[PDB]
Amino acid sequence: RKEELDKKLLEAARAGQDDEVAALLAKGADVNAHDTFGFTPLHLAALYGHLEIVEVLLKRGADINADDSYGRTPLHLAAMRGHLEIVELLLRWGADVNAADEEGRTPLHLAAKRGHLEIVEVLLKNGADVNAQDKFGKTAFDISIDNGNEDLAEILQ
Amino acid sequence: MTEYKLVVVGACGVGKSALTIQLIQNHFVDEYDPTIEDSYRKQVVIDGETCLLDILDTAGQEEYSAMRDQYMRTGEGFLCVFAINNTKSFEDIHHYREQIKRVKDSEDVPMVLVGNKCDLPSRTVDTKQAQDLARSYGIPFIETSAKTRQGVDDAFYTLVREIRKHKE
Numbered sequence: 001r002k003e004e005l006d007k008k009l010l011e012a013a014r015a016g017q018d019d020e021v022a023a024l025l026a027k028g029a030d031v032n033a034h035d036t037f038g039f040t041p042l043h044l045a046a047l048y049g050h051l052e053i054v055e056v057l058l059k060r061g062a063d064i065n066a067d068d069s070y071g072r073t074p075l076h077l078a079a080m081r082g083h084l085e086i087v088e089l090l091l092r093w094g095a096d097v098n099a100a101d102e103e104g105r106t107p108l109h110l111a112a113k114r115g116h117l118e119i120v121e122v123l124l125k126n127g128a129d130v131n132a133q134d135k136f137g138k139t140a141f142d143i144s145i146d147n148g149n150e151d152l153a154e155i156l157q
Numbered sequence: 158m159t160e161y162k163l164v165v166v167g168a169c170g171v172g173k174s175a176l177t178i179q180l181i182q183n184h185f186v187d188e189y190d191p192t193i194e195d196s197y198r199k200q201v202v203i204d205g206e207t208c209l210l211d212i213l214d215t216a217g218q219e220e221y222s223a224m225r226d227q228y229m230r231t232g233e234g235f236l237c238v239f240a241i242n243n244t245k246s247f248e249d250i251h252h253y254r255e256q257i258k259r260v261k262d263s264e265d266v267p268m269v270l271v272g273n274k275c276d277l278p279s280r281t282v283d284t285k286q287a288q289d290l291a292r293s294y295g296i297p298f299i300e301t302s303a304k305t306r307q308g309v310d311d312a313f314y315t316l317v318r319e320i321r322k323h324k325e
């Protein structure tokens with residue numbers, strides 16, 4: 001029952017059915033439920049670009065700082081997917097800007113590696129450590145140099 | 158340390174994410190997000206030497222992705238993973254191989270054929286056909302099973318050794 005309801009909530013968040021998400025939340029589902037890897041409904045809602053589902057989960061009490069088995073918070077997924085509205089909403093709710101995953105990758109590092117300039121500048125505006133170092137000794141500037149993107153290097157400087 | 162820029166390519170549901178997670182965290186994920194594409198860094202010991210593996214789990218169906226194509230061009234080895242219980246994936250392995258050949262624009266590209274889901278007893282792709290395809294392509298074939306974590310390390314080490322042989 002509880003597991004099935006949580007799985008239905010996760011599937012509704014992944015698919016992008018706001019009505020189904022609202023109905024499942026009204027039916028007793030858990031906003032902090034995690035799947036096998038650890039993706040909470042907020043993780044999937046941020047990953048798949050459903051701003052309304054993200055807002056509903058945040059209002060209902062979703063753990064915004066929760067992380068999956070690899071330490072990736074929903075901010076990490078929203079940054080790696082290049083969702084400007086989602087990252088702005090997550091930062092507006094006090095998400096851990098300098099959060100670290102199992103490799104110690106700041107969401108700034110993920111946004112730089114993917115190639116999302118707007119996400120990078122938005123994260124920097126809200127206090128993102130440019131000098132942040134992962135577990136392998138690579139910063140955002142190093143990632144920009146490796147990618148060779150001149151615009152990313154200009155923004156990071 | 159040597160940073161090997163590995164890539165893992167294949168069809169949907171073949172187990173690329175499962176293999177990568179088994180290598181990185183040594184635990185199998187029964188269900189994983191179909192469209193998660195991220196790079197995992199691992200410190201391994203091969204032939205007594207410490208090496209760094211930077212493995213990309215290509216799982217995005219988008220036609221254009223600057224990070225993905227840059228990683229593919231800069232990649233040094235490719236794991237072509239297919240499910241033995243899925244003939245369609247085995248057929249699409251050739252399409253992935255020719256796509257990688259066109260992108261890299263190189264005749265000799267380090268590739269390793271991987272047959273995932275070896276634990277399942279309803280095998281659909283015969284081992285003989287896969288071995289014949291591998292020997293025709295001149296690349297090793299390794300059978301892996303992410304659920305039991307058998308052959309994953311062997312497949313990754315074979316890819317690394319093939320990369321080293323191509324470099325030398």
Ligand SMILES: *CCC(=O)N1CCN(c2nc(=O)n(-c3c(C)ccnc3C(C)C)c3nc(-c4c(O)cccc4F)c(F)cc23)[C@@H](C)C1
Nearest residue numbers: 166167168169170191215216217218219220229256257260
């Ligand atoms: C179920 C989700 C999943 O596992 N996926 C794996 C990645 N993927 C995928 N899809 C896809 O259509 N192509 C592709 C491209 C980008 C261009 C032309 N043809 C194809 C298909 C018909 C093979 C993917 N291409 C690559 C890839 C290309 O194309 C060239 C060089 C190196 C490559 F890796 C790829 F890695 C994944 C592709 C879908 C099925 C989602």
Ligand SMILES: Nc1nc2c(ncn2[C@@H]2O[C@H](COP(=O)(O)OP(=O)(O)O)[C@@H](O)[C@H]2O)c(=O)[nH]1
Nearest residue numbers: 169170172173174175187188189274302303304
């Ligand atoms: N029994 C078994 N199942 C597997 C194995 N590898 C992957 N799977 C299953 O394949 C399903 C989809 O794999 P997925 O993680 O999506 O691979 P991907 O599509 O390449 O990212 C998962 O639910 C796994 O249970 C394996 O080695 N053995």
Ligand SMILES: [Mg+2]
Nearest residue numbers: 174191193216
């Ligand atoms: Mg995947």
